[PDB]
Design a protein around this ligand. Structure first.
Ligand SMILES: *[C@@H]1O[C@H](CO)[C@@H](O[C@@H]2O[C@H](CO)[C@@H](O)[C@H](O)[C@H]2NC(C)=O)[C@H](O)[C@H]1NC(C)=O
Ligand SMILES: *[C@@H]1O[C@H](CO)[C@@H](O)[C@H](O)[C@H]1NC(C)=O
Lengths: 97, 198, 62, 110, 199, 48, 110
């Protein structure tokens, strides 16, 4: 969609994906983390390791990626590649491998 | 090279192709046709509960930006492009148990003057097949390969089976394709049914 | 004793050869790309899933 | 030296790796394929897999990578990264569980 | 860093790392090679694979990386990423797992005369045909064959390293730092340079 | 699960609410498509 | 984050990550190294290999990554990718068959 392209170029003009979104200095980014267990693969006792397949569920707010839908032909949602936006650096801390 | 390079420069530089955008209106869904060819069945590891397959997945979809009239480019009727240059539905095996969601070899797409895009990536997949041990070693197993897009929803793409033709009448390919001449049967597993569903 | 068989592939222009056997065969199957037809001499043993038609007449495999 | 640098600068000024390297799109690319078997690593009878070490020699002609040696100090052969050029997409069709295509992109002799 | 950055900027002007250094035609780039073995990890007999930890010392000279120290505040050494310089593509030919190359691409050390020092570490699994007649009282003759993947003998002259007056015709082993493998003792460790005359 | 680099003054974490919401404290398992492990039964699956 | 975006653009506009971060080339880079052992994974007595999970804390001063917080809204601390700055090339000299150096390039606190 052409309007989708113009919206994407507007949002990512001057957008740095390595910078945490904080409009003021001292502002926190509230990240909400959930998990869905697709499959409990194994619990290897000799390695003391649980193998799971999961879907994370990460929700936050980036103030730089807001727009007026009526100025862009009613587009109210976008699907943007994760490398193009700022992600929280959420990792599994107790990984065994 | 002349007409091939001219057509590439017309489609991707003059027209300013954007691979990040879907080939559809914002409220419209892109129809992806899927078929599967089972090249060979490697193994079903019972203890590790894992099916290993070599499968060539055939993806078809119309991209209205990647179209041309053949008479303005020396009657060229087909073009081979890298898969990294075009928009892809990004079909993955959701049923994997080793984390290898994606296809193995990202080959070229074939585009045609109608805007149709054909892509036949081969893949080696390790999926979770739960094992029923009740009648072992006279048992039969029911494994599945579940293909979907984690990047797009039903509003963005629409999955469907491939439609083939016989004697001018179309039919959906409701099965896994196995080439009878080239297929080598697995050493311990015979295939009884090969259905395909949406 | 000899015979004339066809041996062209699929929908290629027809060709013929001399079979010393007593049958000529047509062999049809379908891979992911389309249908292949193989014509030749004799009555070979085919893998399961392949259509086979053996016939004992001159120019009988088409 | 400066002549090899000048040559590589000119050869890859208006080059397209996607285009088949022939003058006219109606003629095919002629590729010569040879297989060298270095070692038979293993034959596995259960999963029916033969793993071997090979060299896959491929020879063709790129129409757009010609030069006159007299205009470059007499250089007749150079070495180029294979990622920069068009290549045939040779695949092992009966691959079992390995790599379908070449993944080690060594240099080409041009 | 201002002198270091100045030197790097002046050196990398027009430098092509994919082109072999030759100032005149028919020049052959001399490459001296040394191998240090830090630990023999294993010899898997069923795969016929010798797993070793090695440090490969490669020395060559690049006329394009020459400079005068007095023009750069007396700077006498420069550490450059190994990707940015031209390298002799030396690989272990007889590898059994498909890994031809070194494990870590560290920095090269360029000197004012243009002579480049490179010491990348490597994990190598090499093919060792196991003679099984006297197993488990056997001894094996494993080989590590190093050669250029792309260049010929008219382009690089690959030779063994020379220390003060003496050619190092052996695998070097640190006497102090070496821990012996638990199942294998190294009796001989020679090195040779082979060039078939009719090749 | 935690942010590897950012500290509490930069990124604040909270438990993921499910479509049920109501301040959930649980791993979500979709009961239709979840095939139970043949060796293991999930007794409790909380989140904190 | 406009202040931090401006700062990050200013800091890496004339930055070279190859040479050491020292105002004069005759002074050394002072690096503080600490090792945190999270988990002892395995002791392989046959191959004589110890597998451990570690965190390798490295601290040092970069001369060209300084700023005055008053010109950037009071920003005093930031997180930047580690791949775009000079780093020490810390290698584990007695690496048996693992990785000789750090392969996971997490964020730098600046
Ligand atoms: C490159 O290496 C070769 C040896 O492989 C060197 O050749 C000999 O060097 C000695 C000592 O300098 C001379 O006495 C001999 O006359 C050389 N023999 C040849 C073949 O000429 C050669 O000098 C090296 N080149 C450079 C530039 O160091
Ligand atoms: C292509 O084929 C058509 C056949 O009618 C012909 O008229 C035309 O001149 C050919 N060439 C081009 C460039 O269209």
């Amino acid at each position: 969609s052409e309007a989708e392209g113009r919206l994407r170029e507007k949002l990512f003009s001057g957008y740095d994906s390595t910078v945490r979104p904080a409009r003021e200095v001292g502002d926190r980014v509230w990240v909400s983390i959930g998990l869905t267990l697709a499959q409990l693969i194994s619990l290897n006792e000799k390695d003391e390791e649980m193998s799971t397949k999961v879907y994370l569920d990460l929700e936050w707010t980036d103030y730089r990626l807001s727009w007026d839908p009526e100025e862009h032909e009613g587009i109210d949602s976008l699907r943007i590649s994760a490398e193009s936006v700022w992600l929280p650096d959420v990792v599994l801390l107790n990984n065994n491998d | 090279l002349n007409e091939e390079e001219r057509l590439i420069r017309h489609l991707f530089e003059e027209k300013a192709y954007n691979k990040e955008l879907r080939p559809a209106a914002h409220k419209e869904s892109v129809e992806i046709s899927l078929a599967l060819t089972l090249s060979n069945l490697i193994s079903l590891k019972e203890v590790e509960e894992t099916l290993t397959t070599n499968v060539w997945i055939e993806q078809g979809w119309t991209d209205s930006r990647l179209q041309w009239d053949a008479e303005d480019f020396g009657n060229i009727s087909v073009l081979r492009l890298p898969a990294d240059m075009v928009w892809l539905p990004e079909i993955v095996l959701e049923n994997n148990n080793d984390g290898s969601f994606q296809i193995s070899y990202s080959c070229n797409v074939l585009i045609y003057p109608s805007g149709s895009v054909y892509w036949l990536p081969p893949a080696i997949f390790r999926s979770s097949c739960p094992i029923s041990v009740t009648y072992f070693p006279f048992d039969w197993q029911n494994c599945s390969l579940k293909f979907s897009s984690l990047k797009y929803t039903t509003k963005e793409i629409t999955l469907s089976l491939k439609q083939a033709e016989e004697d001018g009448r179309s039919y959906p390919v409701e099965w896994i394709i196995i080439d009878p001449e080239g297929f080598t049967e697995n050493g311990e597993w015979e295939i009884v049914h090969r259905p395909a569903r949406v | 004793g000899s015979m004339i068989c066809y041996n062209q592939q699929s929908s290629q222009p027809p060709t013929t050869k001399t079979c010393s056997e007593t049958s000529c065969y047509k062999k049809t199957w379908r891979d992911h790309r389309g249908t292949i037809i193989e014509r030749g001499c004799g009555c070979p043993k085919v893998k399961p899933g392949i259509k086979l038609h053996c016939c004992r007449t001159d120019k009988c495999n088409n | 030296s400066e002549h090899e640098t000048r040559l590589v600068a000119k050869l890859f000024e208006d080059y397209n790796s996607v285009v088949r390297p022939v003058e006219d799109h109606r003629q095919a690319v002629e590729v010569t394929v040879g297989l060298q078997l270095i070692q038979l690593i293993n034959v596995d009878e259960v999963n029916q897999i033969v793993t071997t070490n090979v060299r896959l020699k491929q020879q063709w002609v790129d129409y757009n990578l010609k030069w006159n040696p007299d205009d470059y100090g007499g250089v007749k052969k150079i070495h180029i990264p294979s990622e920069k050029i068009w290549r045939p997409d040779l695949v092992l069709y009966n691959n079992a569980d390995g790599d379908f295509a070449i993944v080690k992109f060594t240099k080409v002799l041009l | 860093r201002n002198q270091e950055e100045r030197l790097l900027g002046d050196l990398m002007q027009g430098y092509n790392p994919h082109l072999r250094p030759a100032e005149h035609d028919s020049d052959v780039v001399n490459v001296s090679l040394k191998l240090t073995l830090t630990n023999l990890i294993s010899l898997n007999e069923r795969e016929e694979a010798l797993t070793t930890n090695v440090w490969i010392e490669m020395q060559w000279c690049d006329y394009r990386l020459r400079w005068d120290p007095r023009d750069y505040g007396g700077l006498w050494v420069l550490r450059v990423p190994s990707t940015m310089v031209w390298r002799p593509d030396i690989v272990l030919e007889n590898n059994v797992d498909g890994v031809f190359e070194v494990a870590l691409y560290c920095n090269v050390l360029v000197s004012p005369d243009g002579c480049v020092y490179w010491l990348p570490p490597a994990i190598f699994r090499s093919s060792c045909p196991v003679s099984v007649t006297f197993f488990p009282f056997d001894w094996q003759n494993c080989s590590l064959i190093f050669q250029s993947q792309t260049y010929s003998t008219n382009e690089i002259n690959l030779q063994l390293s020379q220390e003060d007056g003496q050619t190092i015709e052996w695998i070097f082993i640190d006497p102090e730092a070496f821990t012996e493998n638990g199942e294998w003792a190294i009796r001989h460790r020679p090195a040779k340079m082979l060039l078939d005359e009719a090749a | 699960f935690s942010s590897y680099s950012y500290d509490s003054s930069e990124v604040s974490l909270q438990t993921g609410l499910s479509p049920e919401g109501q301040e959930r404290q649980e791993v979500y398992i979709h009961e239709g498509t979840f095939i139970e492990n043949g060796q293991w039964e999930i007794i409790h699956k909380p989140s904190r």
